[PDB]
Design a protein around this ligand. Structure first.
Ligand SMILES: [Zn+2]
Ligand SMILES: [Zn+2]
Ligand SMILES: [Zn+2]
Lengths: 89, 50, 146, 85, 84, 62, 237
RNA sequence: GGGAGUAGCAGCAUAGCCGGGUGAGAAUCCCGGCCGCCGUAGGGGCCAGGGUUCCACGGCAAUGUUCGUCAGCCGUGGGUUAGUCGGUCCUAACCCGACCCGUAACUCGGCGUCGGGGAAAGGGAAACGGGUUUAUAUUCCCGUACCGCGGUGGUAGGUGCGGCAACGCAAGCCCGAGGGGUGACGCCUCGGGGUAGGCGGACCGGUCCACAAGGCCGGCUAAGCGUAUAAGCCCGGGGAGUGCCGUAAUGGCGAGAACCGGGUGAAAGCGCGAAUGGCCUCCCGUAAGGGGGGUUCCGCCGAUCCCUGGGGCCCGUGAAAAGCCCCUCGGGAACGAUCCACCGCGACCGUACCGAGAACCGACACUGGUGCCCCUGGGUGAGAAGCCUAAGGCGUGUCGGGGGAAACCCAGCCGAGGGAACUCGGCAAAUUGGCCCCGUAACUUCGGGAGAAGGGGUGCCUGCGGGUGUGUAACCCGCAGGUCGCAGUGACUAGGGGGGCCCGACUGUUUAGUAAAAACACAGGUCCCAGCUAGCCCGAAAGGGUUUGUACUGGGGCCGACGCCUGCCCAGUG
């Protein structure tokens, strides 16, 4: 193993070749999924992947269509309620 | 796979070209007065300064 | 010289250089062969062969294991490890209690059991007084639940 | 560099001849200080051909060496004969 | 537990002596017993780091002592500054 | 000990390499100065009157 | 002769420096050409552990969108709102000039001269008491005993410093002390001059005893001040 | 020169023999067979360092601990191909330059500001299989693909929808700013889902084997593109306490449980890639070249490799920035993509080989060190143990032939009868030894001592039962009877034990190369200085260390876990 490939940031895997060689393949690790700002709870609808994996995707498959998609829905409804209760004056 | 810099490689290349012996016609022309020179080197005896 | 032939043929046939056979009556033909084409055609002709792997049988161990399954070779004199190693500690517990919960849940689904009785038995099984389904059923039909 | 100074020498070895026959390639010895693009021009002018690819390596003698692939319209053997070999 | 006199300090074995092991066990007992929250009134406060306490049931995170969420001096200050 | 064996740990990065200004293997690479000419440390050249290297070079007398 | 650890500390080597790159930032209040009378309002958002403070810190977001670190008082919640200025209320976490602070109040993080940023009672568990309020000075009782005088325009914070009761549980082992002293690189372990050699210490010898009084004068030169320095007394009482 | 044709070319891995050849010449060069060593490394891969040692042809003056037709030696000619591998980019601990202050001065010393560097194992756009050469290949050829800039042409959109909701969608362009996320993180422990790898049974071909029964070999499928469920988290309905629901374990619930339905979401598998590929094998002349057949299934184990979730610990809190994605504002145009199809362009350097009981360092073809840095089939067995073995590699840990041919030495095996009478001293050797059951003292800081001690059992065969499980799959647990031996952990593996005294509480460290200890450290005990422009320290000065600090702190000394205790003198020196 090359010294850089022996570094535990490469998630090895052994794989069989049509001509019978049993090679070792190397891959980088995926990031973790996004988390709300106000509660630290995972977001749904936002997929995990490296910038390579993500730039081969259209916009609307990267986040939900509701407003404030950086927030969980319980917090989204809170901010919206606050806005409307303050827009009375 | 060895990861050398280019200047160092060129210097080793010169060092390799040097390490040969005197041609036969120089000896024939000098009447056996030149048979060697001071830069014969073997890789396992005398080392270079990179 | 024939080091060259041996290595070319070995890594052509995807083998080792010791599992290779060169006919001892045609070494001149082999030596006249400096290219890969010539060594290929000699392989074809059969002057250079890949030998078959020897192998290692398992025919004695098969009979050993047959006899062990049917119940020999498992006495005190054949053991070297502790009982808690040869059979684990937490594995036993997990398989036991999983079995028990499975059975209680099936019994509840078939109406034989009400929530009160199922809860009591769940709690006793966690406490760990049953140790097997036979004990469980003995308890249930000694007491009036079945 | 400038055309007509880039190319120093053509190669005549068994490997180079094999490549001339099979791949339609030429093999040259070149001034260290030239790049793939300058080599491309140089060949185009000094020989009036269209080039497809250039690959380079510096050797263990201090010489830059170029494997040059032409487009299948032309023919290496032609210029190899136009030269000596 | 299973032992009479030692508690959390039955891990040290026959080492380090009486006073040491007693103090350690008493302190860790009082710290690992659950505590009442000042926001929800429920007994679920647990330590997070040195000086930091958190309720598992409401999410209240606050600052306090090193081994208890209150100190005698803090109590005095609370009372005094409420009086004035 | 302090002999044969400790001298096997010499397959690490060197202390000195060649110098652009003088051509001599004396450039300390972890600091950026030559121990022979002062390059990387002085505009001018390191010379001294207790030293014989430059005199030997130019075939002068001591 | 040879040197002392005393003497090598004064040069500033990695064997003696502080590893401040490991810490959270410095803790100051605000510059007061900004705090004329405006009584800023802010919100706590996080409470955190600092390896260079023997006390927790708290992160605050102000109406400016600016973010600061304060030293956390005992009983401050994530989500509270603290005020900083002359006319703020009197509660826990609020910073005021000492003049506006009654007698009897517990106080921490006091400025020496108005504008410094907080010099006193910043260690974990500590507090100070306000004694008197004149028109030219305020008297304060510090955790040592001294009754110091401050100018009445100096700023303080109300309450007590969190982290208290840290020295009740013992350090049981030597590895734990290794880690405690590696956090901030204190010299650990420690030798004894009495078992050192005579080059290396005013004590020191084949016999493991001191042959001169351990009491040294405040006018003894460096390299010699080891033991009891200008001791008024010694012993038990 | 004598020593001397002597020592050494032994010890840690004791390896060669028969037949054939080449050649002037063969213990030691080549081919075949027999016999053998290694076998969690003496195998396979690759850093640093070395620098051509690599490859073929030709040679034998010298080198090679012997010979030599051999060679890491000598001669001649050759050999290292990148849009995707790595540098090149970002910052870290740290460093430099200019200005500034000091210095008699500087090539010296330094705080702050500014600017710049700093990782070939940290962060980080993108390629996989087959073949080709004497010597290169994720680099050349074939086949099948992917990124980033720029374009041409159409659509989505600007001027559109479905769901109560979670959410599902091709869902506008150029410029600037701001926010949010990811990058982005410790030690210990557990479960679940998968994979490499292995085992078994059937079958199709080939070979071994007196027949028979039987054993061994082969039965292959990459990146990419398209596809979904776990766990966790969420949405809606629903409306609970002598309670119910659940986990391996913690545990959950009017601050809204059970129970109904749903949504988002991994590693994998599947399909295409892909059968005139690759392997096994039967044929015609055997030279370029041809022909045919097969490429099948079920079941079990299962990681130290991959993915996902819980729990515990800290007077100890386990990096940053570049870059990438989303949203919102503010400003311009009226056109126009993050979707489909097509095209063009993508520089500079490395790239051979060893990688160590001969290619590095040690003056050497050195039993040392660097590197054991990353990986490892079957059996016995708790086991990456030791023993045997397959693969792969060697017979180059580079001097051989003889022999009752001795004395004596080095490393080993057994010794009647007595059992430490030996010796400063039981030094050396021997005894014991694995697993199950029974039974175990003084003393004690009640945690220990303790495997205390002391005792019995243990093979093969024929059978009977139990646990989990659908299991005449797999792994485990108890008992009877029969029989053989001097001996049943039969080899390998595998503690000798007890009773008193001194010192040190413990784990730890020490005189590299005559001392590992009763010496050092340690937890804890106590004393002294200091309220900060402090106390203590460096320095010629400027300036600095403790200090991104503030008496629950910083510094300076002695005793040294725990237990009971710590008596009199301030005349002397301080
Ligand atoms: Zn939220
Ligand atoms: Zn609460
Ligand atoms: Zn120089």
């Amino acid at each position: 193993m090359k010294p850089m490939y022996r570094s535990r940031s490469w998630r090895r895997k052994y794989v069989r070749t049509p001509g019978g060689r049993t090679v070792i393949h190397f891959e980088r690790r995926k990031p973790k999924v996004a988390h709300c700002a106000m509660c630290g709870r995972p977001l749904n609808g936002v997929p995990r992947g490296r910038p390579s994996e993500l730039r081969k995707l259209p916009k609307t498959k990267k986040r939900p269509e509701r407003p404030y998609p950086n927030l969980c829905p319980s917090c989204m409804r809170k901010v919206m309620k606050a806005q409307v209760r303050a827009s009375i004056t | 796979a060895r990861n050398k810099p280019f200047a160092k490689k060129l210097r080793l290349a010169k060092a390799a070209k040097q390490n040969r012996r005197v041609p036969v016609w120089v000896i024939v022309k000098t009447n056996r007065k030149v048979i060697t020179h001071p830069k014969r080197r073997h890789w396992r005896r005398t080392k270079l300064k990179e | 010289m024939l080091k060259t032939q041996r290595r070319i043929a070995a890594e052509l046939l995807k083998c080792g250089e010791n599992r290779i056979w060169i006919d001892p009556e045609r070494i001149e033909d082999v030596a006249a062969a400096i290219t890969r084409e010539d060594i290929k055609r000699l392989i074809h002709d059969g002057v250079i062969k890949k030998k078959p792997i020897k192998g290692q049988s398992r025919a004695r161990a098969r009979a050993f294991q047959e006899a062990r399954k049917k119940g020999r070779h498992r006495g005190p004199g054949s053991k070297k490890g502790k009982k808690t190693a040869r059979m684990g500690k937490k594995e036993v517990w997990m398989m036991t209690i999983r079995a028990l919960r499975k059975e209680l849940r099936k019994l509840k689904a078939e109406g034989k059991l009400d929530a009160h009785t199922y809860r009591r038995l769940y709690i006793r099984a966690k406490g760990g007084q049953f140790k097997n389904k036979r004990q469980l059923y003995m308890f249930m039909q000694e007491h009036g639940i079945l | 560099m400038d055309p007509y100074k880039v190319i120093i020498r053509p190669l005549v070895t068994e490997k180079a001849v094999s490549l001339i026959e099979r791949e339609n390639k030429l093999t040259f010895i070149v001034d260290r200080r030239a790049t793939k693009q300058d080599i491309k021009r140089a060949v185009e002018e000094m020989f009036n051909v269209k080039v497809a690819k250039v690959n380079t390596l510096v050797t263990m003698k201090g010489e830059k060496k170029a494997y040059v692939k032409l487009k299948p319209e032309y023919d290496a053997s032609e210029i190899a004969a136009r030269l000596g070999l | 537990g299973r032992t009479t006199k030692v508690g959390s300090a039955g891990r040290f074995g026959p080492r380090y002596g009486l006073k040491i092991r007693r103090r350690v066990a008493a302190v860790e007992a009082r710290m690992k017993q659950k505590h009442v929250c000042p926001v929800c009134g429920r007994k679920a406060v647990r330590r997070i780091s040195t000086g930091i306490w958190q309720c598992q049931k409401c999410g209240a995170t606050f600052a306090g002592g090193a081994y208890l969420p209150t100190t005698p001096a803090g109590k005095v200050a609370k009372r005094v500054t409420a009086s004035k | 000990g302090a002999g044969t064996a400790p001298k096997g740990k010499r397959n690490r990065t060197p202390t000195h390499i060649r110098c652009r200004r003088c051509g001599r293997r004396a450039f300390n690479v972890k600091k950026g100065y030559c121990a022979a000419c002062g390059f990387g440390r002085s505009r001018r050249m390191r010379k001294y009157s207790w030293s014989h290297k430059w005199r030997k070079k130019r075939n002068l007398s001591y | 002769g040879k040197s002392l650890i005393q003497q090598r500390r004064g040069k500033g080597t990695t064997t003696f420096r502080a590893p401040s790159h490991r810490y959270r930032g410095a803790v100051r209040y605000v510059p007061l050409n900004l705090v004329q009378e405006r009584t800023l309002r802010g919100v706590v958002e996080e409470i955190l552990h600092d390896p260079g403070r023997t006390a927790p810190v708290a992160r605050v977001k102000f109406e400016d969108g600016t973010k600061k670190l304060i030293i956390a008082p005992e009983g401050v919640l994530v989500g509270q709102e603290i005020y900083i200025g002359p006319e703020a209320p009197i509660a826990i976490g609020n910073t005021l000039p000492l003049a506006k602070i009654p007698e009897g109040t517990y106080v921490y993080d006091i400025e020496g001269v108005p504008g410094d940023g907080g010099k006193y009672v910043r260690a974990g568990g500590t507090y100070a008491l306000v004694v008197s309020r004149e028109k030219d000075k305020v008297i304060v009782q510090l955790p040592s005993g001294e009754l110091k005088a401050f100018n009445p325009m100096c700023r303080a914070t109300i309450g007590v410093v969190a982290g208290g009761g840290r020295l009740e549980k013992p350090i049981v082992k030597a590895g734990k002390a290794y880690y405690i002293a590696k956090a901030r690189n204190r010299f650990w372990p420690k030798p004894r001059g009495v078992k050192m050699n005579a080059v290396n210490h005013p004590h020191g010898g084949k016999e493991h005893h001191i042959g001169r009084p351990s009491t040294v004068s405040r006018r003894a030169p460096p390299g010699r001040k080891v033991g009891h320095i200008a001791a008024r007394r010694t012993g038990r009482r």
